[PDB]
From a paper:
STIM proteins (STIM1 and STIM2 in humans) are single-pass membrane proteins located in the membrane of the ER that regulate Orai channel function in response to Ca2+ levels in the ER.
In this study, we present a cryo-electron microscopy (cryo-EM) structure of OraiH206A in an open conformation at 3.3 Å resolution. The substantially improved resolution was enabled through use of Fab antibody fragments that bind to the extracellular side of the channel and served as fiducial markers in the cryo-EM analysis. Six turrets, from the six subunits, constitute the extracellular entrance of the pore ( ). A ‘glutamate ring’ of Glu 178 residues from the six subunits is the narrowest constriction of the open pore. Accordingly, density consistent with Ca2+ is present at the center of the glutamate ring. Rather, opening observed in OraiH206A involves rigid-body outward movement of each subunit. The outward movement of the subunits results in a dilation of the pore and repositioning of Phe 171, which slides away from the central ion pathway to widen the hydrophobic region of the pore. The H206A mutation eliminates this hydrogen bond, diminishes the van der Waals interactions, and evidently alters the free energy profile of the channel sufficiently to favor an open state in the absence of STIM.
Residue numbers in the entry:
A (entry chain E), B (entry chain D), C (entry chain C), D (entry chain F), E (entry chain B), F (entry chain A): 156 to 216, 240 to 305
G (entry chain O): 25 to 64, 66 to 76, 80 to 145
H (entry chain M): 25 to 62, 65 to 76, 80 to 145
I (entry chain H): 25 to 63, 66 to 76, 80 to 145
J (entry chain N), K (entry chain P), L (entry chain L): 22 to 130
The structure:
Amino acid sequence: AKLKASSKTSALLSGFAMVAMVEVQLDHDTNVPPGMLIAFAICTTLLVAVAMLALMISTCILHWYIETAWAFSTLLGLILFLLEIAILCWVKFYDLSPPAAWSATVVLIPVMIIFMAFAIHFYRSLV
Amino acid sequence: AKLKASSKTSALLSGFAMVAMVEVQLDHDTNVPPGMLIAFAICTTLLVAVAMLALMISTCILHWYIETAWAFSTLLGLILFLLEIAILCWVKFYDLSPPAAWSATVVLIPVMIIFMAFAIHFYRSLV
Amino acid sequence: AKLKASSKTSALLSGFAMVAMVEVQLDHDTNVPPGMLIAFAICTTLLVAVAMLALMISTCILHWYIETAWAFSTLLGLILFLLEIAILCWVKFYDLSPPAAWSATVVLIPVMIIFMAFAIHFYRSLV
Amino acid sequence: AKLKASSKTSALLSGFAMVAMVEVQLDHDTNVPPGMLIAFAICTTLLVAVAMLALMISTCILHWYIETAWAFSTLLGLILFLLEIAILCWVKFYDLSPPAAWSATVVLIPVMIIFMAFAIHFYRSLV
Amino acid sequence: AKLKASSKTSALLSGFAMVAMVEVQLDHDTNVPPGMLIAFAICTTLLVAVAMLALMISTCILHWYIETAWAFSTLLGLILFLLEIAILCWVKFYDLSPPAAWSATVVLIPVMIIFMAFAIHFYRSLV
Amino acid sequence: AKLKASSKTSALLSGFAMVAMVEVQLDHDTNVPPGMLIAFAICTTLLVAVAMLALMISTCILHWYIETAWAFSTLLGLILFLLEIAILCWVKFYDLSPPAAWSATVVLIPVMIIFMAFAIHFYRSLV
Amino acid sequence: VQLVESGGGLVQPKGSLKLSCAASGFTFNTYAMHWVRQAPKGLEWVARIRTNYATYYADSVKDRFTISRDDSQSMLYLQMNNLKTEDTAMYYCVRQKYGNYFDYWGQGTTLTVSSAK
Amino acid sequence: VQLVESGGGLVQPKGSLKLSCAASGFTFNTYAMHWVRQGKGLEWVARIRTNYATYYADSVKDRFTISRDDSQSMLYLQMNNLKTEDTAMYYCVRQKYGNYFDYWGQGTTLTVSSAK
Amino acid sequence: VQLVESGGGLVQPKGSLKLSCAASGFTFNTYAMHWVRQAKGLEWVARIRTNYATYYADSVKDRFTISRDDSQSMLYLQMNNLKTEDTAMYYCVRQKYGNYFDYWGQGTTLTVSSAK
Amino acid sequence: VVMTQSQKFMSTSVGDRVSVTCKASQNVGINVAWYQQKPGQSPKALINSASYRNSGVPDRFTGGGSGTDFTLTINNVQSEDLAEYFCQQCNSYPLTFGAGTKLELRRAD
Amino acid sequence: VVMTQSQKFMSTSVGDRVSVTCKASQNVGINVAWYQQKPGQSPKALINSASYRNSGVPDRFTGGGSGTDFTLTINNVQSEDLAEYFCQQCNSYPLTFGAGTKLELRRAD
Amino acid sequence: VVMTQSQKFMSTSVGDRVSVTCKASQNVGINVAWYQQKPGQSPKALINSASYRNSGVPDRFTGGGSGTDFTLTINNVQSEDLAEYFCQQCNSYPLTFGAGTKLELRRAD
Ligand SMILES: [Ca+2]
């Protein structure tokens, strides 16, 4: 079904965030909190893991549970991708303009709320 | 309908703005007003957020209002890409030659006027 | 019709020239004329604007005028792309070999003449 | 069958690991254990080797054993990409903040356990 | 006919030469003869010009002469890409080890001879 | 037939190795043997030449000999691509960890044996 | 990475001197540096410089000590004045790596502030 | 950035000396430098493109010479056969792509007379 | 690229002397350096890989020592226990990946005798 | 290239707009800079390219013109802005400076 | 922030595990480092972030804790490891150090 | 590794081709360089890798050979090119130089 398109797009976005994480240049005199770097690593690795799980589920193809799991994996991949973009802009700009990073956060807040509410809705209806 | 093509275009443009913004060399000696950095962050983040929102809304499917919102998302992605190019060339050349940046800005104003005029038309006719 | 292919290729070439303009490293002791940098900025921004206008026109779809405008936008996108490549090679090589940049200009002159003559022909027949 | 899609996915992932590994800045002062560099090289080389082997075997066509080997190649490409991301973030952040690397590792362990559990299932059921 | 495939191949190759030439680190201390830089600029510019000309001529449609010109454009794009690789490796390695560059050149001469022999065949048979 | 897919993939892999060879940064105090750099240049140029020959053969379309030559060209392109990846990892890591490069060699040895044996088989049956 | 510092020995109360610390083996321009003292065994912190070029000073000597980094000359200096009889201590110049934890300590420099000879 | 130069004071006619300026706060190796002197109306003196080209004023192209110590990050100018009309103040300056000056030094008096 | 070195002249047997070579025109931190002597039979003396490895000739592996000041951009060689058979000119050269020298210095006479 | 100055002493009150001129000789385009020297200090860079102010400059200073003629003007001229103003062509070495004109004041006699 | 030390002289035999403690005052998280000073030398960095050993450190040293309390321990304590050990908070300037405790020995009387 | 020199004084006229030889001992491959020292100056680098001329070198100098034997030759030998020529192996430290041979001249007696 729509599994192949989801696999393609999720793998593309995962690798995209991966090379983005590759091309981040920091320094031992950075002002970013260590928790920010920890969150960066956790978010990037979780995005990669969720995309890979979606790919494996697509490769796997009582069936309704599997379809819902595939759709939920795609949704969570989108969630983690947006959060990763937020963290990446934060770590890119915080060394110069803290207001720039804060503005990026407050401009990705509403769509994040929308997707979280959408995720809770499907999760509630997911078995 | 045209939602697939529009979502593909917005995704491509957002990915282009992202690969741009990640590979931008900055410096603590830069002369750009911090408002320029703030607007750069806001524009890039809003472009990627709008592209992701459009993709989610398109692939997750008053209703004609939602279709008009899809068209609005496409047009806003276009306009945000234009403003992204403006701010990008500005933050790239402002240390070297301010006249280059201001000339680029002044020659992009008319096409921005045309785009915003069409947007204002469709907003005056927004249901 | 052929609108979707034109939109795809024009957006691709516009973003291509954009990241090219991103990865240009200059210096305050450059020998390039300031007019060259001004032309660089104007040409890049105009190419982006024309590609975006073509995309918006494709999204828009008395019809013959619109079709001719779309084709003319594609043609002018090609013109600006070739001119941008010329300017980019010039600014890349002028710091070392002025003859290299001049040779690049004289090797892109004939195709530029061909496309200008082709542009005048369609423009003359365009209403 | 699904061999085309799986080969395409593995080729994309291998190309992503390669473009990552080529653009990695290293230093003689790095604190990573040389085992980390050895594992990085092994993981990247094995990923590209497995992707190429899968592509060759798929496009060059006991037989169901070969199909199971194709599926195993797909799953191993996925797992190797995950481990590649782990080692990559490790070798990227170990000089700055070891807690970031160790947190990324500890949060990727459960999904690796799930993947290896499915692999061990299919290997206990490997003909 | 085959014009679409040939135009796609030439566009891809031209985009590859362009992304190559943009990301080339040079130095005022380079030992390459300035003729090498001139030939590099000429080759890259001519490749992109020929690719764009082929795309325009193909999508804008004595006539069999134009088709033979299309085939000639494809073959010349191939040969120019080969010479681009030659000059690129030369300008990359000439500061380090001239024998590497000269060996690369001497081992690419026979295949260039084969290509130019086919081209000379089709030019002796060019209407 | 399968000529177009082979042309596309071979051109893609050739250009991939080309930009990889573009982004290799060395130094006059390197520890790599000069023979390694010579082999790097020869392998990269040969891969490009073989891919271009495959593209030209695809453009060309007693026929069985041509089909076998096309398939053999694709196979040899794969051989050279794997060898190029090995050489690239070697030159990337040898400056820090000789064991890493040696491990990369020993991990690409078996698939290289498999492909060489496969190449000898088809070559023996090739006329 | 190697840091060696060399100030002076015995001085007089309310005196002054400047200790210098040569660092060789890393990129000096990309590491915050610190001066840490140890009286004759309770190690106590003294000063920090973020090589913008900000500085921070201890809870006691924010008036009598001043640091300065010559990135080109690649040396770290601390000038002290109005020294009391309770400033006699060894002075290690150390560097910091993103954790506010020092890893490469210097060798020490005795700085006795007394009133005899 | 910060430019501070320090030459000498009173000298004798047909004399010579070299003024030096320390630049600290930017990348010296990527900026062209200038020396500008001061009828209270400022007048240009010399320029060095730190290839290492030099250019000199319409008057003193025979007596003044620049030299940039990029590693030491210093700018030197040696003047010879000074006249009674070279009494001025010498600002070191950097240039940014417009041939326009933005970061000026502090000044350095150079009085050339024959009295005491 | 310009290399100028200046050690001392006449010394005494079993003495010592340190020669210094100034390099200007390239990135010092990325080029291995060498000292080569010439009594007309040119003979190699020493090499330093600017990790910081050092290699010494088949004779003087006990009496000569190289040092590189990358920031100061200088190449020093300290010789001890000189003999009456070390009288030679000492060129400082740079090596480029071929173990072949291309930019030789200017020379520095080091005569080791016991007269005046 | 040579740059003239019409009046050396722009006798001006407080808060009132003042116009200092600079009539270059040849065709110099827009490569003219404007510098302000407070009495006894290193002159600072007010205007580059004859139109764009510098980074740390109050926005009472607007400079215009092109070709051979240029003009700086100060609406709402302050009192602490009594100083000297020089114009310089940025086109062709030797870079020459105008004769310079001070910013005078008119008050009680 | 201030860091206490329970005992200054950890009287310990050879090869036996020893536990040195560091009871910080405020909530400092995991930003605690541990340094070892052999008598008369520049102290070396044993533990950073209270959990991760340094590069060139033997693995008898395991440090744990979080918040306000931390502890280093040495199973199979050597004999050459008689020295002093300091704990430092890495959270808020001024960076303070513990009073420091030596690694004593118990032997024949 | 040691490099011999057959003749030290290549007695040669003007404009006539001359061949100087260098018979290395071991198998050194193509890692041989050729230097020219005009009397009383720092020798310049003529040939690197035994085949490729340097940047600023006139093209009368062609060097060939491989393994153990190498040879430089000068067709249309100039008159200002009376100097000394050394060969050096570039393979294994210690880098040794040949005994060196000058470029003599034959003229009236
Ligand atoms: Ca890059």
